[PDB]
Paper text:
To find a different crystal form of TRF1TRFH, we carried out a series of commercially available crystallisation screens and identified conditions that generated crystals in the P41212 space group, different from the original P3121 crystal system. An initial inspection of the TIN2TBM site showed that the closest neighbouring TRF1TRFH molecule in this new crystal was further away than in the previous crystal system, this time exposing both the TIN2 leucine and phenylalanine binding pockets to the solvent. Furthermore, the loop region adjacent to the leucine pocket that typically accommodates three arginine residues of TIN2 was well-resolved and closely resembled that of the published TRF1:TIN2 co-crystal structure; this was in contrast to the previous crystal system, in which F142 formed a cation-pi interaction with the sidechain of R131. In light of this, we carried out a second XChem fragment screen against the new crystal system of TRF1TRFH. PanDDA analysis of the 981 processable datasets resulted in 50 hits being identified across different sites of the protein, 28 of which were found in the TIN2TBM binding site. After refinement of the 28 PanDDA hits, 19 could be confidently assigned in the conventional electron density maps. However, unlike the hits obtained from the P3121 XChem screen, the hits from the P41212 XChem screen spanned a larger surface area of the TIN2TBM binding site, and most did not appear to form any interactions with TRF1TRFH molecules from neighbouring asymmetric units. This diversity of hit matter covering the leucine pocket and the phenylalanine pocket of the TIN2TBM peptide will provide a firm starting point for efforts aimed at linking and merging hits. Interestingly, several fragment hits originating from our second XChem screen possess alternative groups to the sulfonic acid that interact with R131 and R102, which opens up opportunities to link and merge hit matter found across the TIN2 leucine and phenylalanine binding pockets.
TRF1 is a subunit of the shelterin complex that binds to and protects the linear ends of chromosomes known as telomeres. TRF1 binds to double-stranded telomeric repeats and mediates telomere protection, replication and extension. It is recruited to shelterin through a domain:peptide interaction between its TRF homology (TRFH) domain, also responsible for dimerisation of TRF1 (TRF1TRFH), and a short linear motif of TIN2, known as its TRFH-binding motif or TBM (TIN2TBM). Here, we report the discovery of a series of fragment hits that bind at the interface between the TRFH domain of TRF1 (TRF1TRFH) and a peptide of TIN2 (TIN2TBM), an interaction essential for the recruitment of TRF1 to shelterin, using X-ray crystallography (XChem) and ligand-observed NMR (LO-NMR) fragment screening.
Numbering used by the authors:
A (entry chain A), B (entry chain A): 60 to 202, 208 to 251, 253 to 268
């Protein structure tokens, strides 16, 4: 009699884990394709779904970290976004902490993305005339060896500087898109594959 | 090449329709069992999922109406909730408009629920000392024949009145729970049934 409710709660948990995996994947494809409004709406759906879940596997937790990293990278130019209890931590600094803490291989693409997020954390502060904030951000990032170049640019206050062109926001975005592309190849969820069978069935 | 994106968007739409049906059903069971926080969290999930959808069948739309009716009934004692553009419309009046407009059979249980929502729309106004609001609500509902009894109670200002005991809030709630019980028997969604196979598989 009482085990009937336990049965239902258990099925709701399996189904919610599947919805989480579907939404995490769909958030990755939206970011990769640059569908900004879709990324926003799928983030809202993943957030509500997470509040409905009580248990999580290490793979679901890792996925949640990757999606949090993507949400923060998307808000990297929005210096008004606060993702942590410490209000001084800019959105690109918050993406960088997740990136350097995810259980993933530290390959050359990983290092490249990290160094690009670092330069851009300082660059968006200089881009909005917040020269003192760029210095504060730089202190929390240095506490890579190219810090001598960054510190020299913060003091000079040169906004449209040549260094920020080579290591551009677009370059950081493109290197991150390559990573998202790679993980998706890896990922094939129960939900995506079943719905894709219904689509091929109607062809 | 371009049809590959169309394929993905189509599968995301099928998968989102399945998530909607799962969440609508789970909202119904939470209401029926009186799991209030679960109802709140599942409502938030269904809302976000709906904002991600662009097409809907008449069956999905009807389900959305039933769930909106349940959300408003849950807030029937919350006279501070505004569900429509007209701010004067109390939550129980908003549930009553959906109830009398859903494409469903108008059986004796339907009529009973409607008449119980009507009495309670006036009763929660008298319960909070808003005697003029009960009169205003009564004007928009009458503009059953028992209106002579209701109007006589509004004028007298008798809060803990005998009429409201027979046609109690608990009675309205219980008659609505019977209805929710009945529709669930009807109810088998793709998501609930697949997750329930995984649960039986682990037994
Ligand atoms: O809390 C979260 C979860 C996910 I998935 C994305 C963003 N924030
Ligand atoms: O807009 C909505 C949808 C649903 I399902 C429940 C409540 N509000």
């Amino acid at each position: 009699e009482e085990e009937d409710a336990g049965l239902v709660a258990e099925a709701e948990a399996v189904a919610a884990g599947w919805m989480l995996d579907f939404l995490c994947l769909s958030l990755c494809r939206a970011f990769r394709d640059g569908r900004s409004e879709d990324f926003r709406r799928t983030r809202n759906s993943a957030e509500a779904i997470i509040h409905g879940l009580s248990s999580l596997t290490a793979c679901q937790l890792r996925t949640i970290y990757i999606c949090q990293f993507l949400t923060r990278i998307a808000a990297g130019k929005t210096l008004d976004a606060q993702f942590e209890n410490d209000e001084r931590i800019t959105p690109l600094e918050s993406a960088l902490m997740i990136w350097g803490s995810i259980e993933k291989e530290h390959d050359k693409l990983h290092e490249e993305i990290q160094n690009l997020i670092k330069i851009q954390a300082i660059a968006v502060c200089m881009e909005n005339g917040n020269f003192k904030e760029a210095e504060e951000v730089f202190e929390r990032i240095f506490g890579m060896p190219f810090k001598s170049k960054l510190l020299m640019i913060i003091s000079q206050k040169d906004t449209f500087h040549s260094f920020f062109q080579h290591f551009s926001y677009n370059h950081m975005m493109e290197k991150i898109k390559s990573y998202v592309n790679y993980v998706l190849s890896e990922k094939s969820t129960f939900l995506m594959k079943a719905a894709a069978k219904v689509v091929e069935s109607k062809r």
